[PDB]
Symmetry: C6
């Protein structure tokens, strides 16, 4: 499998992605209710581009974008995760000579809404 990130017309080779949602439960089961969603964590090959660092610097800037998972063999876009109005919250560029893709960017954005396959979570 192979995926990509798309922001501001710029595409980033994505090493790792994750996004999670959760509601608390009371006692056993007994969902407390209320839900948290919209935080997405990405790791990117840093390239020579500086654009992701500037977004972190910019702060209040909110953007839209999509995470597209492509089937390993086949070109066509098995699934795409779209986020709207996401703010840069944390950022870290790390170089490790020790292995593999030494220079990577790892950051977390907080989106107003994420959506996928007709599923929606808005804050």
């Amino acid at each position: 499998f192979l995926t990509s990130l798309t922001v501001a017309g710029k595409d980033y080779k994505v090493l790792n992605v994750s996004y999670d949602l959760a509601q608390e439960t009371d006692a056993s089961g007994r969902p407390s209710t209320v839900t948290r969603g919209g935080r997405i964590m990405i790791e990117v090959e840093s390239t020579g581009s500086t654009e992701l660092f500037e977004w972190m610097t910019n702060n209040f800037e909110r953007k839209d974008g999509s995470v597209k998972f492509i089937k390993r063999d086949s070109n066509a876009t098995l699934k795409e995760l779209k986020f709207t109005e996401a703010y840069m919250v944390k950022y870290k560029e790390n170089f490790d000579h020790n292995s593999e893709n030494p220079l990577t960017e790892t950051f977390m954005i907080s989106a107003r809404k994420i959506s996928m396959g007709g599923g929606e979570f808005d804050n």
Copy 2:
């Protein structure tokens, strides 16, 4: 060994499952009593389907389903774990290019009751 998850007539290849129950003890032994049960943790190959994400989005929706463990060599269903009226509590879709099954879904449901081989735990 190989297992599967069955929900809403949809079958998911299951990488990891677990479900645990516990009662507290007082001093040594001296079970405090009261028991917790019904939480099940599953990890699934994500496919192109989006159905599990929507359930998390849906929130209050409760479902039934079964986890069926099939003997490695043989087709027939060594054991099946059935849950009734389970609510989506936590969900996380994670992509890791690093190894093996890169795209997986890891979630936890809280069932009103689980049952297996005549054994029962209801909340």
Copy 3:
């Protein structure tokens, strides 16, 4: 080395066992005294049997049994740990496709007394 668990006339291939006892010390040495013992942790190949799950469900049921360590080469029973009046306290059945014995049961019982080679600890 190879060991087995014996409960209710049923024998379980045991992957891991442990049982520990401890008394607190005051300052350096200066045993506080009072002792804790009787908790035993076991991991079992799950088979198609459901019996251990039902015991956890049953709760208050106390049983007797023995853990028998057999010398690797030789049939004869190097040592046997016997417990009396043990209550099911925690239980977890876990499936991991990742390696080795994928389907295992891991549980902890709290015994009124354990004994071995003339040694005794009763609560």
Copy 4:
């Protein structure tokens, strides 16, 4: 990929670098705002030079410098991170015979400002 550190006209072979910025969020998203930036963590082959130890000793001394990431194959400077008025905050020289580059220096500096590709963070 290969990088270097430049301080006081002295160049250090850099094994690991990292620098991170973060702002807190309130509830979900809801950035608390306020931001932290300017801390950089570096690991260096110790050589026979003692200069980095003296800076830690010196304490209040602030310096400028740059971290330059060079493309693996090619000489030219894919990206450079520049910091101004950075103070030595933590330092540790560690020798481990166990593997690889046994003698390394690991330290963290706190810069008044970092900048890269037109992006800026000042305190």
Copy 5:
């Protein structure tokens, strides 16, 4: 290197040993003073013997003994650690089929005094 434990005329093949002493410091250096010593941690191949379990059961019983480190090649006793009036404080017999020496005993004794090469620590 190879070592052994000697208690009650019984010798135990020892896999791991450790014993540590410490005094607290105030601010930087500035030893707070007061010292802790005399606790020894050992891991033993369990054999068919039950003697170590009974000592834990016995509780208040204090014993003497020695830990003797023998040079790998040569018979003669490079160093020996002797303890006097040690009380059984913690004990755990653990079986792990996963590797190496599956059946081991891991316990900690609290000695009134340890001594080695003319060095002494008494409580």
Copy 6:
């Protein structure tokens, strides 16, 4: 690379060394100031010597010494760390049959002053 410890005219083959200094920062950067230094952690092949254990026993005894890092290929002393008036604070002799250098001594001394290449930190 290879290093050695020198105390009381006795030389110890050193497996691991480390020494670190740090000052706290307020908010971002904003060094709180005040500094901690002088603690050195060493791991040594235990030999048949008992001298390091006695120093721990002795307690209040302060010593001087040096840690000398020798270039792997070449005899000459790439760098040497010298400490004056250091007190034995923690000590642990550990035997592990599992690998490599089974019998080692790991201890931490607190020096009044450390110095290296004209750099100085005194308490």
